[PDB]
Amino acid sequence: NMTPYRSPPPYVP
Amino acid sequence: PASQHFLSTSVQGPWERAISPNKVPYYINHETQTTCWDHPKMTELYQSLADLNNVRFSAYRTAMKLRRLQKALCLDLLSLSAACDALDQHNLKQNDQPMDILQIINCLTTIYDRLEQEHNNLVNVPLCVDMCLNWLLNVYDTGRTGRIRVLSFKTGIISLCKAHLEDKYRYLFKQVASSTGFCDQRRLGLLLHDSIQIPRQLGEVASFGGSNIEPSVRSCFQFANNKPEIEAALFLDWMRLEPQSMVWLPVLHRVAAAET
Known part of the structure; x- marks a missing residue:
C-alpha cells in the first residue's frame, strides 16, 4: 500500500 | 544474480x-x-489488446484478452497435474507466505522446461519465464517489492492453465479452505481477492464488481443461507451462477472452446 507504482532505474548510456 | x-x-x-x-x-x-x-514483448501484447476494445460484452472482451495472454504465455499447454507437480517440487505449500523473484523464476523454469520437452518449438523457455514473471508481478507486485504470496502465484497459474473449469475451482477453493475442507468468509475473501487482480491488471475490474470483493463474499454467503462456513460443492454451485467477480473465468473457457 502506498507506492503501489514506482519507476525503474533511470536510463544510463 | x-x-x-x-x-x-x-x-x-x-x-x-x-x-x-x-x-x-x-x-x-x-x-x-x-x-x-x-518486457518489450509484454508491452507489445498489451498494446494489441486494444484491438479487442470493440468487443461488446465485458466478460467476453476480458476473456478474449486473457485468452490471448494465456497463449502468449503457453499456459494453455499446462495441465493442472503438471502445475501441481512443479508447485510440489518447489515446496510451495504455505499459501500465506511470500515467494521472491528467484522462487517465481525457478518454479516457472521447471514448468516451461517440461512444456518445452513436450512441444515442438512452441516454447522458448527464457522468453516464457520472463514474460510470465512480468505478468505475475504486474498482477500481484505492482510496486515491485520483489515478492508475491504463494496463494497469488497459484491463483494466476491455475486460473490460466488448461485444466477443466471445475478442477480449477476445486483446486483454488482447496488452497483457501481449512484442512477439513471448510471455507468461512475471510478465507473465501482470500481467493476472490487474488482472483480479481487478474481482470484488474487488464484495466477491466469495473465490469467485475470493482476491486473490493467483500460484496461478492457476502453474496456467496447469503446464497449459502448465511451458514458460517461452506464446502467445495456449495462454492461450485455458486460459481455455476457466474458471479460477477469471477465471470471472466468461465467465459475464458467458452472462448477457448469456441476455438480461438
Missing part, C-alpha cells in the same frame, strides 16, 4: 535486460534511451 545469464536472452536488438539493486528485472532500450519494468 545468476538467473541474469539465463534470462538475458529473452530480449535482443536495442533492448537489454537489467536488474535493479532490489533484485527486480527491468528493461533498457538503448535506441529510445528509456527504461521500463515491462
Whole structure:
C-alpha cells in the first residue's frame, strides 16, 4: 500500500 | 544474480535486460534511451489488446484478452497435474507466505522446461519465464517489492492453465479452505481477492464488481443461507451462477472452446 507504482532505474548510456 | 545469464536472452536488438539493486528485472532500450519494468514483448501484447476494445460484452472482451495472454504465455499447454507437480517440487505449500523473484523464476523454469520437452518449438523457455514473471508481478507486485504470496502465484497459474473449469475451482477453493475442507468468509475473501487482480491488471475490474470483493463474499454467503462456513460443492454451485467477480473465468473457457 502506498507506492503501489514506482519507476525503474533511470536510463544510463 | 545468476538467473541474469539465463534470462538475458529473452530480449535482443536495442533492448537489454537489467536488474535493479532490489533484485527486480527491468528493461533498457538503448535506441529510445528509456527504461521500463515491462518486457518489450509484454508491452507489445498489451498494446494489441486494444484491438479487442470493440468487443461488446465485458466478460467476453476480458476473456478474449486473457485468452490471448494465456497463449502468449503457453499456459494453455499446462495441465493442472503438471502445475501441481512443479508447485510440489518447489515446496510451495504455505499459501500465506511470500515467494521472491528467484522462487517465481525457478518454479516457472521447471514448468516451461517440461512444456518445452513436450512441444515442438512452441516454447522458448527464457522468453516464457520472463514474460510470465512480468505478468505475475504486474498482477500481484505492482510496486515491485520483489515478492508475491504463494496463494497469488497459484491463483494466476491455475486460473490460466488448461485444466477443466471445475478442477480449477476445486483446486483454488482447496488452497483457501481449512484442512477439513471448510471455507468461512475471510478465507473465501482470500481467493476472490487474488482472483480479481487478474481482470484488474487488464484495466477491466469495473465490469467485475470493482476491486473490493467483500460484496461478492457476502453474496456467496447469503446464497449459502448465511451458514458460517461452506464446502467445495456449495462454492461450485455458486460459481455455476457466474458471479460477477469471477465471470471472466468461465467465459475464458467458452472462448477457448469456441476455438480461438
